[PDB]
Scaffold this motif. Structure first.
Motif, mmCIF file in Angstrom:
data_model
loop_
_atom_site.group_PDB
_atom_site.id
_atom_site.type_symbol
_atom_site.label_atom_id
_atom_site.label_comp_id
_atom_site.label_asym_id
_atom_site.label_seq_id
_atom_site.Cartn_x
_atom_site.Cartn_y
_atom_site.Cartn_z
ATOM 1 N N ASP A 1 0.408 11.896 3.219
ATOM 2 C CA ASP A 1 -0.809 12.503 3.734
ATOM 3 C C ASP A 1 -1.905 11.452 3.809
ATOM 4 N N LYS A 2 -2.582 11.382 4.958
ATOM 5 C CA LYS A 2 -3.680 10.428 5.100
ATOM 6 C C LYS A 2 -4.806 10.735 4.121
ATOM 7 N N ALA A 3 -5.024 12.012 3.817
ATOM 8 C CA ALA A 3 -6.062 12.432 2.888
ATOM 9 C C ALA A 3 -5.511 13.505 1.963
ATOM 10 N N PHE A 4 -6.105 13.622 0.782
ATOM 11 C CA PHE A 4 -5.769 14.683 -0.154
ATOM 12 C C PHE A 4 -7.030 15.446 -0.541
ATOM 13 N N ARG A 5 -6.872 16.747 -0.807
ATOM 14 C CA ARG A 5 -8.043 17.590 -1.040
ATOM 15 C C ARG A 5 -8.798 17.155 -2.292
ATOM 16 N N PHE A 6 -8.083 16.954 -3.402
ATOM 17 C CA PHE A 6 -8.732 16.483 -4.619
ATOM 18 C C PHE A 6 -9.300 15.087 -4.418
ATOM 19 N N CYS B 1 -2.059 9.903 0.087
ATOM 20 C CA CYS B 1 -1.182 10.206 -1.034
ATOM 21 C C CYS B 1 0.260 10.316 -0.552
ATOM 22 N N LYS B 2 1.172 9.652 -1.254
ATOM 23 C CA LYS B 2 2.584 9.655 -0.902
ATOM 24 C C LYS B 2 3.400 10.167 -2.076
ATOM 25 N N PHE B 3 4.459 10.910 -1.773
ATOM 26 C CA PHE B 3 5.309 11.488 -2.801
ATOM 27 C C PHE B 3 6.746 11.485 -2.316
ATOM 28 N N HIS B 4 7.624 10.846 -3.081
ATOM 29 C CA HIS B 4 9.039 10.791 -2.742
ATOM 30 C C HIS B 4 9.795 11.679 -3.711
ATOM 31 N N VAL C 1 10.425 15.298 -7.991
ATOM 32 C CA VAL C 1 9.626 14.435 -7.124
ATOM 33 C C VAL C 1 8.705 13.565 -7.970
ATOM 34 N N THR C 2 8.415 12.372 -7.462
ATOM 35 C CA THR C 2 7.465 11.463 -8.080
ATOM 36 C C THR C 2 6.403 11.054 -7.063
ATOM 37 N N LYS D 1 -1.245 12.921 -11.412
ATOM 38 C CA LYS D 1 -1.324 14.054 -12.327
ATOM 39 C C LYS D 1 -1.807 15.299 -11.600
ATOM 40 N N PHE D 2 -2.762 15.135 -10.682
ATOM 41 C CA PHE D 2 -3.142 16.228 -9.795
ATOM 42 C C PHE D 2 -1.918 16.825 -9.114
ATOM 43 N N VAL D 3 -1.198 16.002 -8.346
ATOM 44 C CA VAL D 3 -0.155 16.531 -7.469
ATOM 45 C C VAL D 3 1.124 16.853 -8.224
ATOM 46 N N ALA D 4 1.200 16.507 -9.511
ATOM 47 C CA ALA D 4 2.346 16.901 -10.320
ATOM 48 C C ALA D 4 2.627 18.392 -10.205
#
Lengths: 165, 145, 151, 219
Positions: free
Chosen positions: C89-94, C142-145, C132-133, C110-113
Motif C-alpha cells: 500500500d502506498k499509504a496506511f491509515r495509521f 506499508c508492505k506485508f508478505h 504474515v509478516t 505492530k499496528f498491522v499485526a
C-alpha cells in the motif's frame, strides 16, 4: 448491514487487561496503570470533543455533567443517566445501563478488584485536568461485578487555574 | 484567507508551534523571547478584558486591531492558545481559526503518536497540512470581530 | 467518527514499551477482531455445495475488512509463486498521522499485526488463513508478505 | 450603547481620569438553604464563588450583605465569620446578596498601571512593519478604543461591542481635553483630572450619546 463499527474495543481492552495481568499478577496494577493510560487518552480526546462541540468550558457542575454525557454520547454511544444528586450538588452519579467500554466481556473476571473501567476513569478524569478541573473520580457501582447497573461518582475539588504566565 | 503568521502555545505557556507565511518585518530578537512576549501579551490582555468588562466574559478576549495589521486570538477550553496575525480585509476569522484548529491541528497533532503533549510539535506533515489549509481559501486580510 | 477512539487506544497500545516482548499486542486482538468482522460476514459469495469446493481469496476479505477497518484497499496485490503472496500500500491509515520520514518504523508492523495469525481455513485462498509478516520499506508504503504456515 | 468607562493615562500610564458613566452593576439575591451548592471558597477577604454558577452569578460575584448586613473583609458586621453563619443551619433559609466586586478607584488605577505597558509594548516586533500599538481592542461584552495623540495622551474609552464611529467620540473628548487643559499649567501634565467642568460637559456628551446620531459634532 455492518451498522456497529465498534465491537473491537471491547476486545482490544480485553487484550489490554489480560496482558497487563500476565505481566503483573497484582489486581490493582492493571487498574492504576490502565487508569493513567486512559488518563492520557482523555487528554487526547477532550481536545477533539471541544473541537466539535465548541463548548466554552465546564464552569458549572450541571453543564459539566451535560458535556460529559455528550462526550459519552458522541464516541461511546451511551446515555449517562445523571442522578443521585448531592445536597451540595458537587457530585452526581452516572448511570450506565449498558457499559460502552465492553459489550458482554463476562460477569466473572475470575477474581475481584479487577477494575474494568480504569480507562473510563481516565475517560472522565483526563478531560477534567485538560478543561482545568482538579477532580477526583471513583466508581460507586459496577454491573459487571455481579450487579444490575453501573454508576460512577466524580467529585470536583479545585478549579485548575493557570499560574505565573 | 492568506495571513501573516500563526502562533500555538500550550496552557502552560511554551511555544507548541509557530508558522509563517507572510511575516515581512523580520525581528532582531529571537522568536523564542518573542513567543514569550506574545504569551505575556495575551495573558495580561485576558486579565484586562476579564476585569474591566462590566458584564460576564464568556470567552473573554477576542482580538486587537492596529493601524497597519491585526491580531486574532483563540482560547480553547483545554487552555490551548492559537493566535493569528495579518492585514485588514476579510471575513471575520474566529470561525476560520476554529476550522483550522478542528480540521488540522486536532487532525495532525493530537492524533500523532509521535506527538507528546508538553513538548514542541515538529513534523513536516503538520507543516504541510497547515500550509495548504491556510492556502485553501487564501486571499488575504482579517477585519476580525 | 468512531475512528479517533481506536487511534488513541492504539497509541497507548504502543505507549507501554515494556522490555520483554516485541508484540505489545498478542494475536488475541486479531482473533477477536476478525471474529467480529466475521459477524459482519453473514453473507459471503461462496457456493453452498458440499460436494464442491470454492475458494474465497484472503485478498478479497482483506480488502473488504480494510474498507471496514482501514478504509483503503490494496494498491499492489501480488501473488507470489508459492501459495503465499504480498500486499503493498502506498499509504496506511495509521501512517497518515505521521510524515513519510523513516524515523520509527517498528510501530507500524505492530499496528498491522492485527491481520497476523488469523484463525485459518483449510483450502488455499479461503478467506482467513493468515500467517504474515510486515516488511515496510517506506513510511506510508506499508508492505506485508504472507508465508504459508503449513509447507 | 453607553460608553462604560471613559479613561485616560499619562506617558507613565497612571490613570488620569476615571470618568465612569452610570453603570448599574448587576445585583443578585437568593434565599439559600443548608450548606451550599455554591462554591463558598474564601479568597483573600473576597468570599466569592469560582465554580457552580447559577442564576446569573459570575465568578467575581461576591456576597455584599446577608439580610442587609454588609461584610467587612470576611466577617459579619456584627463580627461573626461568613463560614460561622455557614455552619449554622438554624437561621436557614437565609438571604444571600451577591454582586460582582465593583472596581474602586485604586483598583482602576492599578488596572490602568498594569495595562499601560501592554499597549506600550504591543507586539513591538510585530510581523507587519512600521506598525503601531494596539489601536482597538474588542472583547466579549465591550470594545476598548485607545487613541494615542501621536505622543503623550492616550484616550481610552470602552463602549458596546456593536457600537460604531467611536473614533469621533475620541475626537470630541480630545477637544474637551484641550478645552480643559486651557486653564491650569499648575495642573501638571500628569496630575489626575479633578475638575467638575470637564465632568458636566462630559455628562452632556453622555446625554448626547444616549442618541446615536453624532452631527455638528454632537456634544
Amino acid at each position: 448491514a455492518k451498522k456497529v463499527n465498534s465491537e473491537f474495543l471491547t476486545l482490544t481492552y480485553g487484550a489490554l487487561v489480560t496482558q497487563m495481568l500476565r505481566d503483573f499478577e497484582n489486581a490493582e496494577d492493571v487498574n492504576k496503570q490502565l487508569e493513567r493510560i486512559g488518563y492520557n487518552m482523555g487528554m487526547r480526546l477532550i481536545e477533539d470533543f471541544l473541537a466539535r462541540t465548541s463548548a466554552p468550558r465546564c464552569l458549572e457542575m450541571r453543564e459539566t455533567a451535560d458535556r460529559i454525557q455528550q462526550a459519552f454520547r458522541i464516541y461511546l454511544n451511551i446515555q449517562p443517566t445523571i442522578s443521585n444528586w448531592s445536597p451540595a450538588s458537587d457530585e452526581f452519579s452516572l448511570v450506565f445501563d449498558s457499559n460502552p467500554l465492553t459489550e458482554f466481556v463476562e460477569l466473572p473476571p475470575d477474581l475481584t478488584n479487577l477494575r474494568y473501567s480504569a480507562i473510563l476513569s481516565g475517560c472522565i478524569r483526563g478531560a477534567l485536568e485538560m478543561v482545568q478541573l482538579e477532580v477526583q473520580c471513583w466508581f460507586v457501582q459496577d454491573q459487571l461485578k455481579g450487579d444490575n447497573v453501573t454508576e460512577l461518582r466524580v467529585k470536583f475539588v479545585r478549579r485548575l487555574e493557570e499560574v505565573i504566565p | 484567507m492568506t495571513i501573516f503568521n500563526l502562533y500555538i502555545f500550550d496552557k502552560f505557556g511554551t511555544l507548541l508551534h509557530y508558522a509563517e507565511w507572510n511575516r515581512t518585518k523580520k525581528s532582531g530578537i529571537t522568536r523564542e523571547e518573542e513567543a514569550k512576549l506574545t504569551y505575556g501579551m495575551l495573558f495580561s490582555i485576558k486579565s484586562f478584558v476579564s476585569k474591566i468588562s462590566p458584564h460576564d466574559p464568556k470567552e473573554g478576549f477576542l482580538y486587537y486591531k492596529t493601524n497597519r495589521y491585526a491580531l486574532h486570538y483563540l482560547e480553547t477550553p483545554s487552555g490551548l492558545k492559537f493566535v493569528l496575525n495579518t492585514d485588514t480585509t476579510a471575513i471575520n476569522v474566529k470561525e476560520l481559526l476554529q476550522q483550522l484548529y478542528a480540521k488540522v491541528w486536532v487532525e495532525f497533532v493530537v492524533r500523532d503518536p509521535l506527538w507528546t503533549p508538553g513538548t514542541v510539535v515538529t513534523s513536516e506533515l503538520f507543516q504541510s497540512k497547515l500550509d495548504e489549509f491556510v492556502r485553501q481559501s487564501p486571499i488575504f486580510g482579517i477585519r476580525n470581530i | 467518527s468512531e475512528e479517533i477512539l481506536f487511534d488513541c487506544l492504539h497509541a497507548e497500545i504502543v505507549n507501554y514499551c515494556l522490555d520483554s516482548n516485541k508484540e505489545h499486542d498478542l494475536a488475541t486482538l486479531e482473533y477477536i477482531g476478525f471474529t467480529t468482522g466475521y459477524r459482519l460476514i453473514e453473507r459471503l459469495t461462496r457456493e453452498v455445495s458440499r460436494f464442491k469446493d470454492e475458494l474465497e481469496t484472503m485478498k478479497f476479505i482483506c480488502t473488504d475488512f480494510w474498507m471496514l477497518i482501514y478504509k483503503k484497499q490494496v494498491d499492489n496485490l501480488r501473488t507470489n509463486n508459492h501459495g503465499m503472496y504480498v500486499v503493498q500500500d502506498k499509504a496506511f491509515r495509521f501512517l497518515t498521522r505521521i510524515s513519510p520520514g523513516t524515523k520509527q518504523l517498528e510501530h507500524a508492523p505492530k499496528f498491522v499485526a492485527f491481520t497476523c495469525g488469523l484463525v485459518r481455513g483449510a483450502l488455499s485462498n479461503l478467506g482467513i488463513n493468515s500467517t504474515v509478516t510486515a516488511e515496510v520499506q517506506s513510511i506510508p508504503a506499508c508492505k506485508f508478505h504472507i508465508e504459508v504456515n503449513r509447507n | 450603547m453607553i460608553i462604560y468607562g471613559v479613561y485616560i493615562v499619562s506617558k507613565s500610564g497612571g490613570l488620569i481620569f476615571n470618568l465612569d458613566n452610570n453603570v448599574p452593576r448587576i445585583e443578585h439575591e437568593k434565599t439559600f438553604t443548608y450548606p451550599l451548592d455554591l462554591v463558598l471558597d474564601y479568597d483573600s477577604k473576597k468570599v466569592s464563588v469560582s465554580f457552580n454558577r447559577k442564576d446569573g452569578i459570575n465568578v467575581g460575584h461576591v456576597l455584599v450583605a446577608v439580610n442587609g448586613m454588609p461584610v467587612n473583609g470576611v466577617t459579619l458586621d456584627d463580627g461573626r465569620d461568613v463560614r460561622t453563619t455557614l455552619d449554622a443551619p438554624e437561621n436557614y433559609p437565609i438571604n444571600l446578596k451577591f454582586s460582582r466586586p465593583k472596581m474602586t478607584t485604586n483598583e482602576k488605577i492599578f488596572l490602568a498601571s498594569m495595562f499601560y505597558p501592554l499597549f506600550a509594548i504591543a507586539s513591538q516586533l510585530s510581523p507587519e512593519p512600521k506598525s503601531s500599538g494596539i489601536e482597538i481592542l474588542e472583547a466579549d461584552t465591550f470594545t476598548l478604543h485607545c487613541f494615542q495623540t501621536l505622543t503623550g495622551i492616550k484616550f481610552i474609552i470602552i463602549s458596546e461591542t456593536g457600537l460604531n464611529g467611536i473614533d469621533l467620540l475620541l475626537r470630541k473628548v480630545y477637544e474637551l481635553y484641550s478645552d480643559y487643559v486651557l486653564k491650569n499649567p499648575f495642573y501638571s501634565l500628569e496630575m489626575p483630572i479633578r475638575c467638575e467642568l470637564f465632568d458636566n460637559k462630559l455628562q452632556e456628551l453622555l446625554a448626547q450619546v444616549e442618541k446615536t446620531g453624532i452631527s455638528n459634532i454632537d456634544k
